[PDB]
């Protein structure tokens, strides 16, 4: 059997699998009312991608397609989504939405670029500041269309356009809810083909998250906007490449200080692609910057982790 | 000895190592007057990062630091840099510039985000559209500071800030020159610690590039802006992880169709981290979307490739 492995990376050498920014922290907390069911960054340990997960961090929360004028004060345009190649999106694919589609509720902010303009048009005149809100009835990426609310710049009708994500935004009636999935089909249909929700099931355990601060371009004054993922993008890509057979349901892993060899904590890496630790309460881990994970062994369902 | 390998990735499954966007094409061209000496996406086959190369595509052309008011006409603020991971930047570090610094001459466009603002401040009011020009006298990232030119938004003095790249720009006196390295110390000092320039040394050979179209927010009307890299970011990260010893100075690689194994063409993968092919002239390669490179064997500098 091909041996299971992890890449050797410090946490600042990891990318959030739900937004194209580096990991900053490890964080554990109880689920309490959150249904932890993100659709990006989902991969089994033997290499099966799930949800809307694909391999490129530069495609997470990125969209492209053709703009269409829309008679609405919020979504002045729609984006008719296309694959990177240029073909129209196919809603019959067995996925929740185009791969990389945002998997949090609220407003995604970024920049739309369109047909290039002459230099004399002015500075950054082919850059449009855009809000993509999931509370809009026009957010229907599974059907092949999303709504664009423009803030700066004139969005041209019927031009091949790219959206580059920058951060999130909170306005007066649209909170940022990272654990509330969008309705990928709007009100036409419920979500389909979802990666499963995850939770600790062993006494005393909590999920462990790879945590980043996402830029927030409106609202959340004096507050941190966090985006938490279950696997860094580098682990998704590693498991996809390696496709090592999963020998049990749980891979025992440990986070070590490479200088002293000390185990800072051990953790369960579940075969469906998430981590639990033995802890009770909200806890941003205090860990040395050079620490990294190592794979120990495949364990059974009744392994009791050392408290951390 | 650990065997050298390449990741199993199609070209649309890889990221440009000089700008955070997916690869779109393979492209070969003669060097003619270009000094091909990019500093991002530089890595030896045995895993030694060079130039300004680091591991995260989400850090390429990204900057972070503290803003400082400036009385220049072009740059209303400077950004006092750190490393993209947040580690303090010392100009005495043995690098050309902070890792991920842009390695093309011209204008980089993106969005600065700063301290979060109240909802009532307005839409995208913590998003500033920025030009970072390498021809500005304040582009001195090696010294620890770059100039920020405001287009949209009010850049705040003395705030911790993040710059997210979106594309490039061409104004009336600043062309986009992807093979002219910036002066990382401006006119104050010469460039240091550079990864070497590369060129075909064998008869009938040209460099093979991984090519993307970069968004252009001003200028280049009717034209596509291209950014060409020597190695995909995923190859950089793979060589860094594997650190397989290079048995000779040249690895023979084959671009194959994985279904059957038929070789479409062969190429030389050089020890310092670049590819050559046997071709004369500018040529965007025609390749099936499912093809990928595969390591064949170690050869020398005088292996004669089949023309392609």
Numbering used by the authors:
A (entry chain A), B (entry chain B): 3 to 310
Manuscript excerpt for this entry:
Human noroviruses (huNoVs), members of the Norovirus genus of the Caliciviridae family, are the leading cause of acute gastroenteritis (AGE) and are associated with almost 20% of all AGE cases worldwide. The major capsid protein (VP1) is composed of a shell (S) domain and a protruding (P) domain, and the P domain is further divided into the P1 and P2 subdomains. The P2 subdomain is the main determinant of NoV diversity, antigenicity, and glycan binding patterns. In conclusion, GII.13/21 huNoVs have developed a novel GBS that interacts with glycans via the common β-Gal through a unique glycan binding mode.
A more important factor contributing to the low prevalence of the GII.13/21 huNoVs may be the GBS of the GII.13/21 huNoVs, which is easily interfered with. The function of the GII.13/21 GBSs appears to be easily blocked or inhibited by low-level glycerol molecules, suggesting that other small molecules with a glycine link structure also inhibit the GII.13/21 GBS. Indeed, we also detected a glycerol molecule in the GII.13 08N2045/2008 P dimer.
